[PDB]
mmCIF file of C-alpha atoms in Angstrom:
data_model
loop_
_atom_site.group_PDB
_atom_site.id
_atom_site.type_symbol
_atom_site.label_atom_id
_atom_site.label_comp_id
_atom_site.label_asym_id
_atom_site.label_seq_id
_atom_site.Cartn_x
_atom_site.Cartn_y
_atom_site.Cartn_z
ATOM 1 C CA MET A 1 154.352 49.848 -20.397
ATOM 2 C CA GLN A 2 156.706 47.371 -22.065
ATOM 3 C CA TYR A 3 159.172 48.739 -24.740
ATOM 4 C CA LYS A 4 161.352 46.771 -27.170
ATOM 5 C CA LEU A 5 164.800 47.514 -28.590
ATOM 6 C CA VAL A 6 165.895 45.909 -31.868
ATOM 7 C CA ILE A 7 169.663 46.044 -32.451
ATOM 8 C CA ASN A 8 170.625 45.785 -36.155
ATOM 9 C CA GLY A 9 174.450 45.907 -35.736
ATOM 10 C CA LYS A 10 177.332 44.770 -37.977
ATOM 11 C CA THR A 11 178.458 42.188 -35.481
ATOM 12 C CA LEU A 12 175.595 42.087 -32.933
ATOM 13 C CA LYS A 13 171.947 41.374 -33.855
ATOM 14 C CA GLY A 14 169.041 40.826 -31.379
ATOM 15 C CA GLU A 15 166.232 42.176 -29.244
ATOM 16 C CA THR A 16 165.655 43.167 -25.607
ATOM 17 C CA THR A 17 162.826 44.617 -23.549
ATOM 18 C CA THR A 18 162.431 46.946 -20.589
ATOM 19 C CA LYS A 19 159.566 48.162 -18.432
ATOM 20 C CA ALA A 20 159.156 51.957 -18.188
ATOM 21 C CA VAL A 21 156.604 54.667 -17.441
ATOM 22 C CA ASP A 22 157.267 56.647 -20.646
ATOM 23 C CA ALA A 23 159.190 56.491 -23.938
ATOM 24 C CA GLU A 24 161.817 59.036 -22.910
ATOM 25 C CA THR A 25 162.934 57.122 -19.789
ATOM 26 C CA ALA A 26 163.165 53.895 -21.957
ATOM 27 C CA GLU A 27 165.501 56.007 -24.130
ATOM 28 C CA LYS A 28 168.014 56.778 -21.369
ATOM 29 C CA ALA A 29 168.124 53.085 -20.281
ATOM 30 C CA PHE A 30 168.503 51.746 -23.865
ATOM 31 C CA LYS A 31 171.280 54.249 -24.700
ATOM 32 C CA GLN A 32 173.175 52.909 -21.664
ATOM 33 C CA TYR A 33 172.691 49.249 -22.665
ATOM 34 C CA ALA A 34 173.954 49.995 -26.234
ATOM 35 C CA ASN A 35 177.053 51.774 -24.897
ATOM 36 C CA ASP A 36 177.926 48.902 -22.468
ATOM 37 C CA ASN A 37 177.895 46.492 -25.459
ATOM 38 C CA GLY A 38 179.741 48.647 -28.025
ATOM 39 C CA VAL A 39 176.891 49.540 -30.415
ATOM 40 C CA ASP A 40 176.633 52.918 -31.989
ATOM 41 C CA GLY A 41 174.278 54.435 -34.387
ATOM 42 C CA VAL A 42 171.131 56.183 -35.478
ATOM 43 C CA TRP A 43 167.935 55.956 -33.357
ATOM 44 C CA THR A 44 164.313 55.750 -34.502
ATOM 45 C CA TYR A 45 161.053 55.370 -32.566
ATOM 46 C CA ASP A 46 157.643 54.031 -33.612
ATOM 47 C CA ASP A 47 154.974 55.131 -31.141
ATOM 48 C CA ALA A 48 152.346 52.643 -32.481
ATOM 49 C CA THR A 49 154.438 49.519 -31.553
ATOM 50 C CA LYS A 50 156.451 51.136 -28.665
ATOM 51 C CA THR A 51 159.621 50.000 -30.404
ATOM 52 C CA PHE A 52 162.985 51.766 -30.605
ATOM 53 C CA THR A 53 165.371 50.585 -33.409
ATOM 54 C CA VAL A 54 169.091 51.308 -33.523
ATOM 55 C CA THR A 55 170.714 50.673 -36.952
ATOM 56 C CA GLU A 56 174.518 50.741 -37.359
#
């Protein structure tokens, strides 16, 4: 399935996507992407839209 990440940062705003077998694996990949770009925050997940949001 395709999952989306919305980044609502102070200095960085955008969206990205990844392909994964389950929501948990998409979580490990997205936490890595956020760390490589300097974003840190609180995580939320909406199972109906397969979307993870990180708000700083």
